[PDB]
Amino acid sequence: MVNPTVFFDIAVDGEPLGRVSFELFADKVPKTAENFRALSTGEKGFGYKGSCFHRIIPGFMCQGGDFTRHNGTGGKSIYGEKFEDENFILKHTGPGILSMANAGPNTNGSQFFICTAKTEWLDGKHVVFGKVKEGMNIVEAMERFGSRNGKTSKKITIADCGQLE
């Protein structure tokens, strides 16, 4: 069975930048993948549509998914509060990897990050659950609006998102 695809349309201060699409490894992290997918379609009554990438660090990663507080301190899963770290089967192999952000062990919410480089020190600490499929060049574009402390020089938002088919 083929893995789900989702898309984000990214804007930079209201201006469309482009689209990023992701394959979600429902086959290897089924629960973590379904959370991100459901959050992307908004099908549970809430989700990523309209939220921001609040922390972007060049040559490191782009983090977003805090749709309730817009700065890293909020978010929630479709399972309630927070959910457990499902496995560390997939590794931070390189750029385009999509991984759950977390507060501690088994504190997975709605927050996620997209690698812009290999991030092996996170192998075993963050649950990898997908990868960029199209538009890695758009993440690279996003990346130039970050800084060493992550604060972004312009506002980066998910203008729209959903499931491709």
Q: What is the DSSP letter of 105?
A: T
**Per-residue CA distances from 161 to 85, 130, 158 (Å):** 25, 16, 7
**Cβ–Cβ under 8 Å, residues 100 and 32:** yes
Q: What is the DSSP letter of 138?
A: H
The tokens describing 94, both together, are 């390189």
Amino acid letter for position 135: G
Q: How was this one solved?
A: X-ray
**Cβ–Cβ under 8 Å, residues 60 and 116:** yes
Residues serving a catalytic function are 55, 60, 63, 102, 113, 122, 126
CA–CA separation, 156 vs 151, rounded Å? 11
Amino acid letter for position 120: E
Give the domains, in start order, of the chain with CATH numbers: 1-165 (2.40.100.10)
Sign of CA dihedral 163, 9, 137, 95: negative
Q: What is the resolution of this structure in A?
A: 2.0
For 7-39, letters b (16+ CB in 10 Å) and e give: bbbbbbeeeebbbbebbbbbebbebbbbbbbbb
- How wide is the angle at C-alpha 135 spanned by C-alphas 22 and 40, nearest 5°? 35
